[PDB]
Design a protein around this ligand. Structure first.
Ligand SMILES: NC(=O)C1=CN([C@@H]2O[C@H](COP(=O)(O)OP(=O)(O)OC[C@H]3O[C@@H](n4cnc5c(N)ncnc54)[C@H](OP(=O)(O)O)[C@@H]3O)[C@@H](O)[C@H]2O)C=CC1
Length: 284
């Protein structure tokens, strides 16, 4: 079967499952383990690594930095800037600091982490300057709903936006009503974060559901793998699960090979139905 890829920035076809790093860089005795988890993912064909300045207050970025040493040409590196750093007075410095901790001279992609009080115009000019200087190849956003994206498109050069990173998983389908359709209409890939719902922390009976467990068992796959396949069932969606466990990384990479039937998806629609209303943008 055809490989599941996404056009992402300057990269024409990245694999549709990448590597999250939230809660890496926190525990300094787990450094080497985290490096190996990232390295196993790259080994198994995943290229997109997603981090941020927020994550363990620079720690995640440092871990990713050691992990990608000698492998910069193998990875598609995405980081992010706090809304309060996303204007003239702090953009260059926050990027410079991310880059230093990553031990690299460029990002493939830089995302506004979420929307704050800096006018979008200012943020876009700041990003375009980083592009011009070669610090980032492309820029994008995170945690923007349909209305924020429309506001971004009304901004000069705001259509250069490369992705929108938003929460999406089986038990939180809100983006399906209006956001994913808008994104498809403008050829904008979505990065899906918490694609496993934090291994069921964000939904009490998700991982423990009866039908789900049996649907996984019949395929010989795990629940997490079933939920990943679900996220990337349609094109233009790049899931970024986090896995500091090698066993989990390898499984996540194998989720790329899973094509769920029309029967199975309708059953999942009965258990976790799509939205019938403009729902507010879910975030963690
Ligand atoms: N833009 C934003 O505001 C935000 C962006 N993000 C990004 O999205 C990424 C993903 O979101 P996140 O919050 O980490 O949650 P996820 O849905 O990715 O779940 C992560 C959890 O799932 C576990 N896990 C991973 N793979 C498996 C598997 N195959 N089987 C069983 N358990 C598994 C992990 O355990 P273990 O590590 O021990 O394997 C961890 O506890 C983050 O790492 C970050 O890069 C996240 C939140 C906010």
């Amino acid at each position: 079967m055809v490989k599941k890829t996404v056009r992402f920035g300057e990269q024409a076809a990245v694999p549709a499952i990448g590597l999250g790093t939230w809660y890496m860089g926190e525990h300094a005795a787990q450094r080497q383990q985290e490096v190996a988890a990232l390295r196993a993912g790259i080994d198994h064909g995943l290229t997109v690594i997603d981090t941020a300045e927020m994550y363990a207050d620079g720690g995640a970025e440092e871990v990713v930095g050691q992990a990608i040493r000698g492998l910069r040409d193998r990875v598609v590196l995405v980081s992010k800037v706090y809304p309060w750093h996303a204007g003239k007075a702090a953009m260059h410095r926050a990027c410079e600091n991310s880059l230093r901790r990553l031990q690299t001279d460029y990002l493939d992609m830089y995302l506004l982490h979420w929307r704050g009080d800096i006018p979008l115009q200012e943020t876009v000019e700041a990003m375009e300057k980083l592009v011009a200087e070669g610090k980032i190849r492309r820029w994008g956003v995170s945690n923007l709903d349909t209305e924020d994206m429309q506001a971004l498109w009304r901004t000069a050069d705001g259509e250069h936006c490369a992705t929108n990173q938003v929460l999406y998983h089986l038990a939180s389908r809100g983006i399906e009503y209006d956001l994913l359709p808008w994104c498809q209409q403008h050829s904008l890939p979505v990065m899906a974060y918490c694609p496993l719902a934090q291994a069921g922390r964000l939904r009490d009976g998700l991982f423990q559901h009866s039908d789900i467990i049996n649907m996984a068992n019949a395929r010989g796959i795990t629940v997490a793998q079933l939920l990943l396949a679900w996220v990337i069932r349609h094109p233009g969606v790049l899931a970024i699960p986090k896995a500091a466990s090698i066993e989990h990384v390898v499984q996540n990479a194998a989720a790329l090979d899973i094509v769920l039937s029309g029967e199975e998806l309708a059953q999942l629609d009965r258990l976790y139905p799509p939205p019938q209303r403009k729902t507010r943008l879910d975030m963690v």
